[PDB]
Amino acid sequence: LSDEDFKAVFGLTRAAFANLPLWKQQNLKKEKGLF
């Protein structure tokens, strides 16, 4: 995912996503298109 497209997916840039705690990253990744 391109950073800005990633932002379009998750609402925040990859940097900001990584700034999030592991569980939050996992939650967002699950929400993306896993569960």
Q: Rounded to whole angstroms, how far apart are CA atoms 3 and 13?
A: 6
Is the dihedral angle over the CA atoms 17, 21, 22, 24 positive or is it negative? negative
CB 21 within 8 A of CB 29: no
Domain total in the chain: 1
Token pair 């940097």: residue: 15
Residue 8 belongs to a domain with what CATH number?
Answer: 1.10.950.10
Amino acid making up residue 30: K
- Range(s) of the domain holding residue 18: 3-33
Technique used to solve these coordinates: NMR
Rounded to 5°, angle at Cα 8 from 28 and 1: 80
Phi, psi of 21 (to 5 degrees): -65, 150
